[PDB]
């Protein structure tokens, strides 16, 4: 992406999440899979829905009809009316297609970075306590039990 993690650092696309796509987590060894923080995924109810809502309900219009009707001695005004219409069609079509082209790159990237930090979170503690594997995989030498994936997700870990 714009910062290159989704198909840039992590070249995958796993079956996790389902809603809430950003919330931290680390992995440790409890088993497999990832989870949200329930806040960074309210940033999904903000980030996304109010990106949408802003692009949706911010648009308000007035009461009108482009319909006019003109006789035979009015081909000057008809040209003018239907010129105004053509204008605004063009203007909106371009601007809409643009936003749908622009913001979607941005939001296909928006996922790229906030899910990336999950990696930078563990590196900030685990560093070399876990050997590197290119899949987005760490491999820590020491042995923890099924109660470690609810530990550094919080932020606290023992021996960095």
């Amino acid at each position: 992406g714009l910062f290159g993690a989704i198909a840039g650092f992590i070249e995958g696309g796993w079956t996790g999440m389902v809603d809430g796509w950003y919330g931290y987590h680390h992995q440790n060894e409890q088993g497999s899979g990832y989870a949200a923080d329930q806040k960074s995924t309210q940033n999904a109810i903000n980030g996304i829905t109010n990106k949408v809502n802003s692009v949706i309900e911010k648009m308000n219009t007035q009461f009108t009809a482009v319909g006019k009707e003109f006789n035979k001695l009015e081909r000057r005004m008809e040209n003018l009316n239907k010129k105004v219409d053509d204008g605004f069609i063009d203007i909106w079509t371009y601007n809409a297609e643009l936003l749908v082209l622009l913001e979607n790159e941005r939001t296909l990237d928006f996922h790229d970075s906030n899910v990336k930090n999950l990696y930078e979170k563990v590196k900030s503690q685990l560093k070399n306590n876990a050997k590197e594997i290119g899949n987005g995989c760490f491999e820590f030498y020491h042995k923890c039990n099924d109660e470690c994936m609810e530990s550094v997700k919080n932020g606290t870990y023992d021996y960095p």
Partner: protein, 323 residues
């Protein structure tokens, strides 16, 4: 003892286009463009619309006796019609400014048929009796539901005037015709006094209109023809009539109240009780999505028109499965 972390990849085979690449398979896409017209006519802005049938305007305000349909009508936000009219105007003639009033009859709070000048003894010194074969309602002949035929009486056509004061507080739809006779003899057969003037006055500006004695072409029975004119009377004024011949007054006036201009919809689709916020000459629309592609011409507070294929917006991440 591994750490492998990633991102979603659900069932959706859905796609999206972006600036830096196209065909991006997504996880959960949302459309930003309403493509959906219910192919049905609706009520708009809380209030129902009008009815006409085959009839188009002229078959209402003038009351052409071909659509018995229209007897009692309350209030409309906008007007429906049909792009099929075979009967809308009885006696051939030109309708002065027939689009301008079509702009003023669109959004109206109230309308009433009332005998401006009562058919009973409003016109002595004048013979009614006037009907035409151009508009006969099954069998024996007729003329309009909203106007008269002030034909010349016995063996005269005397000088006269008749007024209408600014009665019903708010506005009233004041129209009036001008009779253009076929033969020089058919002129004298009815309206007597020849080359005689016709004028109709309101507070200011008296429109000067002249009868052209016309032996003009044939289309739809008795082709002397007649000229229809109109206006709108406010409060704080009056209307006056005068004739030495060649004049049609109305028999029905129309009390109204309006300020905002809508428009006309020419649609054949059947009519329903829906309360939709956007109405197009295609169908009704869900006015949520900010841009619409249903039809260019839009009546009602509507999304903005676009020539786009779609506007599929992204809510989620990139979908790269293979479990």
């Amino acid at each position: 003892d591994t750490i492998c972390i990633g991102y979603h990849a659900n069932n959706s085979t859905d796609t999206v286009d972006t600036v830096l690449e196209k065909n991006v398979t997504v996880t959960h896409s949302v459309n930003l463009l309403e493509d959906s017209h219910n192919g049905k006519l609706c009520l708009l802005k809380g209030i129902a619309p009008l009815q006409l049938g085959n009839c188009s305007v002229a078959g209402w305000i003038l009351g052409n006796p071909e659509c018995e349909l229209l007897i009692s009508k309350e209030s409309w936000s906008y007007i429906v019609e049909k792009p099929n009219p075979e009967n809308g105007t009885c006696y051939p003639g030109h309708f002065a400014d027939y689009e301008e009033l079509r702009e003023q009859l669109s959004s109206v709070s109230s309308f009433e048929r009332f005998e401006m000048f009562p058919k009973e003894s409003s016109w002595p010194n004048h013979t009614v009796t006037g009907v035409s074969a151009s508009c006969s309602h099954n069998g024996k002949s007729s003329f309009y539901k909203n106007l008269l035929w002030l034909t010349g009486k016995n063996g005269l056509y005397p000088n006269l005037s008749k007024s209408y004061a600014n009665n019903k507080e708010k506005e009233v739809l004041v129209l009036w015709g001008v009779h253009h006779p076929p033969n020089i003899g058919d002129q004298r057969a009815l309206y007597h006094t020849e080359n005689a003037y016709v004028s109709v006055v309101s507070s200011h500006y008296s429109r000067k209109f002249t009868p052209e004695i016309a032996k003009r072409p044939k289309v739809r029975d008795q082709e002397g023809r007649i000229n229809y004119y109109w206006t709108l009377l406010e409060p704080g004024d009056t209307i006056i009539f005068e004739a030495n011949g060649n004049l049609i007054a109305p028999r029905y006036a129309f009390a109204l109240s309006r300020g905002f201009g809508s428009g006309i919809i020419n649609s054949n689709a059947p009519m329903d009780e829906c309360d939709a916020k956007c109405q197009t000459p295609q169908g009704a629309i869900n006015s949520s999505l900010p841009f619409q592609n249903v039809h260019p011409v839009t009546i009602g507070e509507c999304p903005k028109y676009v020539r786009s294929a779609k506007l599929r917006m992204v809510t989620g991440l990139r979908n790269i499965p293979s479990i």
